TrEMBL record:
GO aspect biological process, one term: regulation of ARF protein signal transduction
Range of the intact protein held here: 200 to 354 of 374
Protein name, as recorded: RalF
Organism per entry: Legionella pneumophila
Name of the encoding gene: ralF
Organism classification: Bacteria, Pseudomonadati, Pseudomonadota, Gammaproteobacteria, Legionellales
Molecular function GO labels: guanyl-nucleotide exchange factor activity
Length: 355
């Protein structure tokens, strides 16, 4: 069955599975030459070529905060037909179409995309607003952790009555129908979600049973809720032109993943950028995200972002545990930049006569 994009699809699968940026570049290139829409075509390939594509990379592209990514995610979700479909079956299906990133802000964008589209395809039937669809989805995901996390004893598990109470008046000032919620509660109880998370996240990851006692980790943790303090008090190696913003965590994301927030570092001179995500385990999060705290450091798109992220990672006494390629950078380039910063620190300490 020849289709106008068949040749492109076969080329893209190869390029994409090697480096997603090279696959996306070819869709951009073909859409330019064939006068087609890059957004629609990308989402179409992600959806139709599910069984052929690296789902980690698909999940990562869809969940990433980017102008292209956001448009592609909206178009991707639109490929699903949720009209007169069972809510939970629709959510299960959506969550299996990619590999979930292990990053709170990415999971959040994917969940919000699902809710909005499900509501739009079943307008005011069982759900009254996109906000109600989103709260129902995050409460269902947390209900899944509650009912199936063994650290939550049988006697402590959330009851259907407790789910009803949490969702009282959240269906655009009204309630969700009793049986509509009972069906979700019972099915989730009987069958947990199939949640396929990535093994490692892009960039640098510091994670160990001793990371919470690292001087840099403690300072980083405090920096999330402090006001007008310089980031150089946390990371000496990054210089004095680095400014910061903090994205505070949504409560449910904290429960779900151990998320504590994201600090965005921007160099005022160079435009170098890096993000720093913090995770601390809790009784709910550990079931899916492990028993260790985590720090994820990712370089942005701009030149010299690699060196800003590497300097931040190298300022920890704890070593980087995991390295993974980003959409823009090769794993080897992140490794070289970090190892080099560690070697420079060692030389400087020795030359200044530090023990």
């Amino acid at each position: 069955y020849f289709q106008g994009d068949s040749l492109l699809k076969n080329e893209v699968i190869k390029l994409f599975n090697d480096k997603p940026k090279s696959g996306i570049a070819r869709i951009k290139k073909w859409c330019t030459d064939n006068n087609q829409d890059f957004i629609a075509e990308t989402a179409k390939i992600f959806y139709e070529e599910k069984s052929n594509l690296n789902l980690e990379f698909v999940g990562d592209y869809l969940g990433t905060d980017g102008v292209d990514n956001q448009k592609v995610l909206e178009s991707f979700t639109k490929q699903f037909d949720f009209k007169e479909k069972d809510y939970l079956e629709s959510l299960r299906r959506f969550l299996q179409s990619f590999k979930l990133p292990g990053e709170a802000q990415k999971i959040d964008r994917l969940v919000e995309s699902f809710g909005t589209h499900y509501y739009e395809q079943n307008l005011n039937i069982d759900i009254n607003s996109k906000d109600a669809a989103y709260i129902l989805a995050y409460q269902t995901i947390m209900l899944n952790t509650d009912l199936h996390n063994p650290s939550i004893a049988k006697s402590k598990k959330m009851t259907f009555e407790q789910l009803k109470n949490n969702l009282k008046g959240t269906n655009e000032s009204k309630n969700f129908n009793d049986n509509f919620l009972k069906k979700i509660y019972d099915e989730i109880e009987a069958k947990p979600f199939k949640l396929n998370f990535v093994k490692t996240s892009p960039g640098y990851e510091l994670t160990s049973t001793t990371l919470n006692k690292d001087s840099t980790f403690k300072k980083l943790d405090s920096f999330l809720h402090s006001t007008d303090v310089n980031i150089n008090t946390v990371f000496p190696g990054i210089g004095d032109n680095v400014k910061t913003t903090v994205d505070q965590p949504k409560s449910w994301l904290s429960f779900f993943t151990g998320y504590k927030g994201t600090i965005t570092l921007t160099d005022n001179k160079t435009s170098a950028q890096a993000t720093i995500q913090v995770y601390t385990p809790n009784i709910f999060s550990k079931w899916l995200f492990g028993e260790q705290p985590r720090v994820i450091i990712q370089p942005g798109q701009t030149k010299e972002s690699i060196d800003l992220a590497a300097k931040a990672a190298a300022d920890f006494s704890s070593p980087v545990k995991n390295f993974k390629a980003t959409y823009d950078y090769e794993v080897g380039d992140l490794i070289k930049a970090y190892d080099n910063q560690k070697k420079l620190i060692t030389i400087e300490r020795n030359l200044a006569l530090k023990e």
